[PDB]
Design a protein around this ligand. Structure first.
Ligand code: CL
Ligand code: CL
Lengths: 93, 97, 105, 78, 103, 95, 83, 97
DNA sequence: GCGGGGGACAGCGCGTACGTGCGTTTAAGCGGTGCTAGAGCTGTCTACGACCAATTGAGCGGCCTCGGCACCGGGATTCTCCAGGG
DNA sequence: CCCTGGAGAATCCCGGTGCCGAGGCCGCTCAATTGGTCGTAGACAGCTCTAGCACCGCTTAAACGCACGTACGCGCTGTCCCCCG
């Protein structure tokens, strides 16, 4: 049956970043875990923020501030910029 | 007369573990709180309960910390706590690196 | 372009990140920028990590990123290391660090 | 300001802490420690206020922060 | 009600509302607000038990935060549960390390 | 003047059920209310993952139950399951 | 067939090998039993939980996932096995 | 003949095991252990071979983390040899029971 | 701030436990074969939950009086540190 | 000067008192309950097909057990000063 995975997107980005470089089955697996972990961590903390503010909906404002709690500085800052960029990009297009 | 060095210490321990009142006077603490927050955002107001909450959380934490500090002192056949203990305590807690 | 990923100029599947946020009971309703943002932040990080892993792979003269390479990556980066400060990587191993007092004089 | 955290106050906390004898260098060490603590908690707190669009940090922002940090506190609207 | 119909003191209604609204799942069974309200009721009893005791022991008719703390930290099983919780105005248990005591 | 909820009155009723001739302070009352909400989240939360983990959409008394068994220490869990299974059966009696 | 004393599978050279990756140079003889003590409290914790998931999933087989969920629960998240 | 001085092979072995990632506990013993403990919780359980392997991955990580912090405690006490009491201090401080 | 006591810390030496090596011994790991239990995928029917509306008191804020207890100025008890004796 | 037995501080224990938050009732309202429809999540019985367990023997790497001595755990001392009163 279908087992979904971020295996393609991780490949894509790896090729973008280290084009003469492959990933092992285990390594992929690990990567695949990391995405899922950070997904929940983010998604969850966003969910708390909606709730805490009697709010029925998770908008990227939530996902943003979620990010500012979860990540350490340089990581957070870049990620925020990176994120609000693709949103802007997304609206217009 | 004179009480032998360390005997009021033991007496004070008894007195404070028996009480639940806060040990840092509110206003210095309060001023410390406002200072630290200003560095994150300007023109801010605090609920008096918001300051108490912080105060409780902080003291409780520090006491816990001395507890564990004190064990390290003791682990080193010592009886005086020293910064090197705190560093080990926190290190193992995984607070500090 | 059709793919919402392309509209956002992203490698990550914004449709997937969208389904998941709903089949996940985080809230009644989900905005439309939230998947996008999140799908991107996911990307920043996989990139940020893959970057340092590849470098780790390189020094170890290797074509292929194996978990030691992720581990070396993670615990060498102050910040990534803290994000994953409570996490274990299968086959990671540990950083070579031997305490002073155990070294001969 | 920070030095507003008085030596005797730090002494009392260590007494309630179970500590008998205190080195001089501790006091300052305590201060950095306490500072780091509040910072992290207040950083998270404020972030909640910034997201609640308020100029007044509440108890609940604090409380939410302490939860985030695994230092849950009871008695301010759990 | 339903607190009645389950012999509970704890609002079986309130609880069913909170589960549905707090985004735990799509749908919410009929037994669960009852099962949980009960477990909530059970545990608040154990605390109120041992704290009250403690207020007797400490010779007071009214329970203050300390009595809770004493009840909690002295109970091996409760203390675990609230292993990461600081209780406002709890104080600490009295404990003085041996080697610190006089000779 | 907003109508803020709590568990206060029920905490009291249960207090009477165990220590009829004893009272409580507001300060300790908050702690009891905090305690209740914290425990409610932790159990509810666990239950929530349980459902997900098992590709199922409903949080039943069973989910709650096993949640309790992961959340609670050996003995306290034990009694909890009791009171849990009891009040439920007693509930499914009446209608 | 019945199973007994298996903790002594955790031989002394292994409890050694781990300590070395751990940066330990000199090992006191009373360490090896304490480690087994600890490893046991550790495995009893993860498996109590792993199992509770297995029982809830109404299964006779414990899966990589039940394990991983347990670890996550105990704040010892693990990558490499699903999740 | 020839004889490496005490502590010389320890340092070597540390470096050996800090370069690699392969599991240190033997595979079969480990499994027998886990099957025991699990039996004594519920009889008639089977395991995905990957599920054992998970628990082991998780086990060794912990113990190596543990020894790390034990080691610090030995060193705290102007010692170089780790002792049950060291482990014991690490676990109290980690807030394990 | 003052004054002096005991705890930190450094030096040394004794006693021994733990690292090292070798020969002996045990069982892990390998891959190869065989068996069925149980997971996972499948397919039908229906019970149980969500959802809507209309009626009803449980629960909250606002209210006052009252008593558990936080306060005090007097006396009752258990520790400790000084001085006396060898 | 060290060791023993003595002395006086410091804090429980009490009786009067006193004040403000407990704990109680007043009454309004909004969240809960009731009666009811609709459809779907998941129960359950059927079926297949993975991988988990079992069992064996050829091979040998690892583990065990003992011998030896080295260098570290720790116990002692002795000084100087950093904390407590
Ligand atoms: Cl949005
Ligand atoms: Cl149910």
């Amino acid at each position: 049956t279908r087992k979904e995975s971020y295996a393609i997107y991780v490949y894509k980005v790896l090729k973008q970043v280290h084009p003469d470089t492959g990933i092992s089955s285990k390594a992929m697996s690990i990567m695949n875990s990391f995405v899922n972990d950070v997904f929940e961590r983010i998604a969850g903390e966003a969910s708390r923020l909606a709730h805490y503010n009697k709010r029925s909906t998770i908008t990227s404002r939530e996902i943003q501030t979620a990010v500012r709690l979860l990540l350490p500085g340089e990581l957070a800052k870049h990620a925020v910029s990176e994120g609000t960029k693709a949103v802007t990009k997304y609206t217009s297009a | 007369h004179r009480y032998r060095p360390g005997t009021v210490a033991l007496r004070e321990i008894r007195r404070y573990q028996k009480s639940t009142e806060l040990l840092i006077r509110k206003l210095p603490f309060q001023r410390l709180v406002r200072e630290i927050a200003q560095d994150f955002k300007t023109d801010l107001r605090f609920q008096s309960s918001a300051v108490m909450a912080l105060q409780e959380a902080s003291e409780a934490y520090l006491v816990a910390l001395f507890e564990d500090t004190n064990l390290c002192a003791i682990h080193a056949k010592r009886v005086t706590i020293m910064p090197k203990d705190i560093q080990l305590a926190r290190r193992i807690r995984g607070e500090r690196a | 372009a059709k793919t919402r990923s392309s509209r956002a100029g992203l490698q990550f599947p914004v449709g997937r990140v969208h389904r998941l946020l709903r089949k996940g009971n985080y809230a009644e309703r989900v905005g439309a920028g939230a998947p996008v943002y999140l799908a991107a932040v996911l990307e920043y990080l996989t990139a940020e990590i893959l970057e340092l892993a590849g470098n780790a792979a390189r020094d170890n003269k290797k074509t292929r990123i194996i978990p030691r390479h992720l581990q070396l990556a993670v615990r060498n980066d102050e910040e990534l290391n803290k994000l994953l400060g409570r996490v274990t990587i299968a086959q990671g191993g540990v950083l070579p660090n031997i305490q002073s007092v155990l070294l001969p004089k | 300001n920070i030095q507003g955290i008085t030596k005797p106050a730090i002494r009392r906390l260590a007494r309630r802490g179970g500590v008998k004898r205190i080195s001089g260098l501790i006091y300052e060490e305590t201060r950095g420690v306490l500072k780091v603590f509040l910072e992290n908690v207040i950083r998270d707190a404020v972030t909640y206020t910034e997201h609640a669009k308020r100029k007044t940090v509440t108890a609940m922002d604090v409380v939410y922060a302490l939860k985030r940090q695994g230092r849950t506190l009871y008695g301010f609207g759990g």
